[PDB]
Amino acid sequence: MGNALTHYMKPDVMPGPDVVPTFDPLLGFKSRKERVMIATQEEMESAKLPLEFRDYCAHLAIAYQACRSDTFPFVYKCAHQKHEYLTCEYEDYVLRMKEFERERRLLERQKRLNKAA
Amino acid sequence: PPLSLKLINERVLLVLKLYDKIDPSKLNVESHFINDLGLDSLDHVEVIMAMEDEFGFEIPDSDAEKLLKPADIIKYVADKEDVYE
Amino acid sequence: YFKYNQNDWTRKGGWRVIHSRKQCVPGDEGYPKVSDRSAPSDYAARGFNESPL
Amino acid sequence: HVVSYRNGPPPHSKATKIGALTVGGAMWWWVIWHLWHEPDHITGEFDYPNSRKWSNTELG
Amino acid sequence: EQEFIKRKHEATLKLRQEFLKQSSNPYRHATGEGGTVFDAGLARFQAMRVSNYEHFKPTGKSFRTGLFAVVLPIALYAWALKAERDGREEKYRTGQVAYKDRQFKFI
Amino acid sequence: PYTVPHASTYKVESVPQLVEVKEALGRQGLKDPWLRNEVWRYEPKAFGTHRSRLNTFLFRGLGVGFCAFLATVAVEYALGI
Amino acid sequence: GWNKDYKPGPYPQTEKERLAAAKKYYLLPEEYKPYADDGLGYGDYPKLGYGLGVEAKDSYYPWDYPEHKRNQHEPISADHDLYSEDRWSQAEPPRYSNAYYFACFLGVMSGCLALYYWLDDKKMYRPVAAKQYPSPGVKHYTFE
Amino acid sequence: EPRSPMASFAESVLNVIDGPITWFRESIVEPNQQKQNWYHQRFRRVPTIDQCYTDDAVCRFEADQQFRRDRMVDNEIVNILRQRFEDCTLYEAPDHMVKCRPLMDQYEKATENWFIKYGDLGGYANAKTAYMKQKHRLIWERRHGPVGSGM
Amino acid sequence: AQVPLAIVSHKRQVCSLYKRALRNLESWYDRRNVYRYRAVQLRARFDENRSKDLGEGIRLLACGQRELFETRHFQPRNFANSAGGCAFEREVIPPDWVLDYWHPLEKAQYPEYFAKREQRKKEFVTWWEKQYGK
Amino acid sequence: VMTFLFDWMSLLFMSFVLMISSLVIFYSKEYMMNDNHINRFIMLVLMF
Amino acid sequence: MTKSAQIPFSSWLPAAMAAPTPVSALVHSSTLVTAGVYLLIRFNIILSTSWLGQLMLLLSGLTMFMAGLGANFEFDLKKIIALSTLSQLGLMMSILSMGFLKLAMFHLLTHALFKALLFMCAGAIIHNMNNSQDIRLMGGLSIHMPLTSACFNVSNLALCGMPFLAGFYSKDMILEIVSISNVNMFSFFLYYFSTGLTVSYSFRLVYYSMTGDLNCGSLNMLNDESWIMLRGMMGLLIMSIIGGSMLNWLIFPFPYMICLPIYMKLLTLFVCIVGGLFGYLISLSNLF
Numbered sequence A: 001m002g003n004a005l006t007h008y009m010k011p012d013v014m015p016g017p018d019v020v021p022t023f024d025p026l027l028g029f030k031s032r033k034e035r036v037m038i039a040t041q042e043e044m045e046s047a048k049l050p051l052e053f054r055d056y057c058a059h060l061a062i063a064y065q066a067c068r069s070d071t072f073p074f075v076y077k078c079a080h081q082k083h084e085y086l087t088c089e090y091e092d093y094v095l096r097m098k099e100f101e102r103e104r105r106l107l108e109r110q111k112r113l114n115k116a117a
Numbered sequence B: 001p002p003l004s005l006k007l008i009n010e011r012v013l014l015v016l017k018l019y020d021k022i023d024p025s026k027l028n029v030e031s032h033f034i035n036d037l038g039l040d041s042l043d044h045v046e047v048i049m050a051m052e053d054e055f056g057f058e059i060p061d062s063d064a065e066k067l068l069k070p071a072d073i074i075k076y077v078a079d080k081e082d083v084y085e
Numbered sequence C: 001y002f003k004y005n006q007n008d009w010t011r012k013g014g015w016r017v018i019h020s021r022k023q024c025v026p027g028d029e030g031y032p033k034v035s036d037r038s039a040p041s042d043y044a045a046r047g048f049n050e051s052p053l
Numbered sequence D: 001h002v003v004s005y006r007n008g009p010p011p012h013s014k015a016t017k018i019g020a021l022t023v024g025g026a027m028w029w030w031v032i033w034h035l036w037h038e039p040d041h042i043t044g045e046f047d048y049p050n051s052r053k054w055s056n057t058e059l060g
Numbered sequence E: 001e002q003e004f005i006k007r008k009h010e011a012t013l014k015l016r017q018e019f020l021k022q023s024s025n026p027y028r029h030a031t032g033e034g035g036t037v038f039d040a041g042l043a044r045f046q047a048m049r050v051s052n053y054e055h056f057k058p059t060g061k062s063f064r065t066g067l068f069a070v071v072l073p074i075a076l077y078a079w080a081l082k083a084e085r086d087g088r089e090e091k092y093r094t095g096q097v098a099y100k101d102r103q104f105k106f107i
Numbered sequence F: 001p002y003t004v005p006h007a008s009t010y011k012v013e014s015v016p017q018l019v020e021v022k023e024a025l026g027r028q029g030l031k032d033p034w035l036r037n038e039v040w041r042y043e044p045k046a047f048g049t050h051r052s053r054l055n056t057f058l059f060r061g062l063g064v065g066f067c068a069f070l071a072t073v074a075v076e077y078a079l080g081i
Numbered sequence G: 001g002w003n004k005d006y007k008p009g010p011y012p013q014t015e016k017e018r019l020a021a022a023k024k025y026y027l028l029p030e031e032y033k034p035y036a037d038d039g040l041g042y043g044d045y046p047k048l049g050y051g052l053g054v055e056a057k058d059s060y061y062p063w064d065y066p067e068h069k070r071n072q073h074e075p076i077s078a079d080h081d082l083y084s085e086d087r088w089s090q091a092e093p094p095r096y097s098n099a100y101y102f103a104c105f106l107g108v109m110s111g112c113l114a115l116y117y118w119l120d121d122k123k124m125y126r127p128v129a130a131k132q133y134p135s136p137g138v139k140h141y142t143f144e
Numbered sequence H: 001e002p003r004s005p006m007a008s009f010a011e012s013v014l015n016v017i018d019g020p021i022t023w024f025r026e027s028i029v030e031p032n033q034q035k036q037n038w039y040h041q042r043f044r045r046v047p048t049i050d051q052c053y054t055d056d057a058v059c060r061f062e063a064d065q066q067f068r069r070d071r072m073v074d075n076e077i078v079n080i081l082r083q084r085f086e087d088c089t090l091y092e093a094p095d096h097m098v099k100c101r102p103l104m105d106q107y108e109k110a111t112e113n114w115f116i117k118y119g120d121l122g123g124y125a126n127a128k129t130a131y132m133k134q135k136h137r138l139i140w141e142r143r144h145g146p147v148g149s150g151m
Numbered sequence I: 001a002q003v004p005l006a007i008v009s010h011k012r013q014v015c016s017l018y019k020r021a022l023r024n025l026e027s028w029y030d031r032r033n034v035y036r037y038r039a040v041q042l043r044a045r046f047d048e049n050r051s052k053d054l055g056e057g058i059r060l061l062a063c064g065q066r067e068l069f070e071t072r073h074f075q076p077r078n079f080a081n082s083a084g085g086c087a088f089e090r091e092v093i094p095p096d097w098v099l100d101y102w103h104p105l106e107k108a109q110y111p112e113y114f115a116k117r118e119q120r121k122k123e124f125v126t127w128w129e130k131q132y133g134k
Numbered sequence J: 001v002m003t004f005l006f007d008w009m010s011l012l013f014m015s016f017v018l019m020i021s022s023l024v025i026f027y028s029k030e031y032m033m034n035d036n037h038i039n040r041f042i043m044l045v046l047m048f
Numbered sequence K: 001m002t003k004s005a006q007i008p009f010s011s012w013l014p015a016a017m018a019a020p021t022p023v024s025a026l027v028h029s030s031t032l033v034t035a036g037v038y039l040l041i042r043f044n045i046i047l048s049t050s051w052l053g054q055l056m057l058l059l060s061g062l063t064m065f066m067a068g069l070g071a072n073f074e075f076d077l078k079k080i081i082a083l084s085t086l087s088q089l090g091l092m093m094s095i096l097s098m099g100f101l102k103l104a105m106f107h108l109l110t111h112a113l114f115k116a117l118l119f120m121c122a123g124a125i126i127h128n129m130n131n132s133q134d135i136r137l138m139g140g141l142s143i144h145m146p147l148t149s150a151c152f153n154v155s156n157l158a159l160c161g162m163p164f165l166a167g168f169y170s171k172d173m174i175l176e177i178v179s180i181s182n183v184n185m186f187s188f189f190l191y192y193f194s195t196g197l198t199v200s201y202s203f204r205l206v207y208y209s210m211t212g213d214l215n216c217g218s219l220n221m222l223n224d225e226s227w228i229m230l231r232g233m234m235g236l237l238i239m240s241i242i243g244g245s246m247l248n249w250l251i252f253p254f255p256y257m258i259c260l261p262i263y264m265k266l267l268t269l270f271v272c273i274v275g276g277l278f279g280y281l282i283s284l285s286n287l288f
């Protein structure tokens, strides 16, 4: 069982694994803010961040590396603000879930678009 | 470990007195297992296997035919354990 | 041996040490930093740039 | 190499019992200390959203 | 068949007493020159391993063993090597591959 | 083998497992001769029972661990609240 | 004793020569059994061993050579390498035939390969749209 | 500079390592050493196998030796370029997909040119064999077009 | 000074089948009470067939050996110190004449032991001359 | 080339394997004091 | 694959129980079984993109299933711990195929620590018992070895996944990162079942060797007066207690974020309790 089983059943309803949005944004025409980044590429390369961990909040990971190098090897003192970095990742994950859920609703709208004609 | 002949004698007579098909009386080291006692051909296999699970080594079939009394049982155990005192 | 008898460019058969770039966290000297030796000839010099020839 | 026949072990020394209580105390102290101070790893570090009762006006 | 087992047992007892006499000898040990007690079976095994050719005759079973054991894998393996190298040589000499997209440049 | 026991110190009726397998064999109508040989095992004084061995195995030193946990609670409140 | 003195001779073809060959190899006349002269046979050599192994022989017999499990003048088996305690010899006989083990193993492997590569195109996935990365020119928006 | 205790401990251990060796160099090894001069050995240009005659063997030796020496020189050309690419990979540890692509382009061009000059000659590569290879290759690019296009 | 004889009796075959069946039975059943109950059950199964004659006894012996081959455990319990176990012949003791090839300075560490060894060499050559002759 | 790598992964695993081997050898003296040539076992464990 | 004993070249470890016990500890715990994983940690860039990743994700999962079912059905202590090494290697190699070399290395170091202690224990048990290591012989060692039984308890629960141990800090992070990433249904079925299989054969080894009737034989020796073994036992015991605790804080410059649902997060603990009860209560033997 699972959602992939529904991907074997409803391909036009279920989006699938790792889907591109396939839609023009601002379809609801609300005030969607632009995701900006405080840090730039130069200090991102100076902090030796890998290509996988370059999210939209990599500066919290940069501050976590600063607190790691400030107190080493005793790195149990930064833990709470370490949790802060994880919460940013959690917020990013929520947005990903948001997009996926929005995707499903839009394909559901496409289903009644198939009932439009 | 360290063994002596009296410990082997005490162990063999103890586990033979624990056997219920033989009576605790009329049991001696020179007593024959076949005609002096009431054990049949199949109970000798149980006696030999009790010797095996006590002393920790298995006994072959022809050596089981060779042993007929507790005296050569003690001699057979003392041969492998190599006490000889 | 690893400080003054490294594999120089004049010979083959020393312990040729190649080192990676150290990371720079905030609180270090020159935190906005680009990697140096970005010219192509500066990689794997082994002391050729200081040669008298 | 002490040996006991048709019986259990000889009665152990003070050092082995004190060490056994030390091992059990250290292991259960570490376990209970980590269930008190960091109980967040067992349940989950963040609360999972349901993604079922989200409003359609927010998501468009 | 019981008397056959008894005769084999008597021969085994004679060979066992011969082994116990000869393997545990003071005077053969005391010379200091090492060696082996005289065993007929090891010598017969060694000379069977060395001098085996005189019992070999040209027979269709022996010819089939020598054909499908040695000559036939040599023939198919040489044919496979020749076919692969002929196809790769025709591809290499026709001009169907470039100097930059060529396998095994030794570089 | 230094301290061999007597033949009279082993009794079948002391161990309940030998009692229940002898009762099952009596229901079957048969008897086991070697049942007196395993009296020294399943002995409740030197060896433990099944329930006590599991409790002394899995929960061993848990009172000592809880006491050390309460000690760390007591000393950690003075340092960092 | 050399290789020319002690040597397997010709194939006997005679009951008297078979008896003399059995007397030569310390083998009882009923025991001796020469190889069939098919071109790859051994002329004047007994066919011994050839069971499921030398490990099938009992270790409780007082052998003169316990490292090979043989007597003193007992002749060596012809394929003594292949049937030795190193290779292809067992104590007990095997429970099944030789094809059963390979058949069960290849059946289990065929089933697991078919089940895994049938489910390769349908993989489990959490409800996550796409991982987000800052390539230049995304113009990507949040939900605020 | 001692930001963390681990870095301060590493600096202390590196100073304890660094002190006696530079003392032994600057106090013992660097005195009593004479100043001798050694030079990188330079070679003239012998005439190539093109000017050599068929029966001449005194000049085929010089052409074969300079062909072997040029093969050696190009071998550490390609080897040095490969070490430049590897040092690019180590120095740009999370970003070697951008910085090392032109260095990989020069390395691939050098390997292609090395195989065009020296490839398929074998173990016994004389100066005659590479010249016959170059003549046949230039004949093929005159008639049939470049190698790999077809024909 | 006897060696075992290669003949086998029907009593020997029934005894060996009983011993191997009980070994397979205790390899199948780990606990001692269950093993003793199944041993009395196997004792009843082997005691029920005592009254039969020789031919039916031979047929039942062959059927029991075949069935024990069918139900044989994949890892039977065996004693490690005996033959067939894991700990059988863990070390190989060389014969004592390598002690005869020691250095005299190496022989000086045990002089009483080597003098006792020389005395037992005289006793052994006397024993070999009176046992196996000249 | 004869090559050495010094990254954190290799150094950490190399330290862990050396610690494991030291504590197994300190176990192995009491385990193998009944053995004959313990020196053979320990030098072979060191080359391992 | 041939070095780390996978399908079908996995037969050389029950051979490797014929080695002496300290070098069997070194081989299975670290060194030769580990080396195959290290080369694939190096080649994870090729494996995460090629079809070799799918092939190893099938094959090491099959090694997990075979190893756990084997160690549930085997009656040999040393072979059971060799099958446990095989199950842990299959769990590590499967994680390696889907990237996650750091998680594979994190489980490798903790597995080397705890496995060695169990092998050092098992050998301490075998020395005190007559060499024979059949688990039907030793039955009641929880009283008779109050420190060896405690060390076996701690490292066995570390192999199980008792929470906040060195085994748990990497087994939970392996089993939840697979639950947030894309996984085949067969490989997702083979994972949780194998973790359940591991506490099943671990608690079966608990009931056989310990907490039961002693079945070894009429003459035996049993003591805990040896201490040269036990000092190294205490050293790896303190290391197995705080080993994943010191390592989780320094192997990860970027901690992996877990946002699973509550049932998939508690699935590994739930199958640990189900396999612990199922690997023990089935192993209880009564009459009839």
Ligand SMILES: CCCCCCCCCCCCCCCCCC(=O)OC[C@H](COP(=O)(O)OCCN)OC(=O)CCCCCCCCCCCCCCCCC
Pocket (backbone or CB within 6 Å): K231, K232, K234, K235, K236, K238, K239
């Ligand atoms: C808290 C958490 C973190 C820590 C724990 C976790 C990580 C560590 C894991 C292990 C924990 C401790 C385990 C302790 C086990 C017992 C160790 C010990 O101290 O044993 C005693 C030892 C041997 O005693 P004995 O049996 O008498 O041996 C004969 C004489 N050696 O006797 C001695 O040690 C005393 C004599 C020592 C003599 C040498 C001292 C050092 C000298 C300099 C050596 C330099 C070597 C340089 C060459 C190699 C390196 C390049």
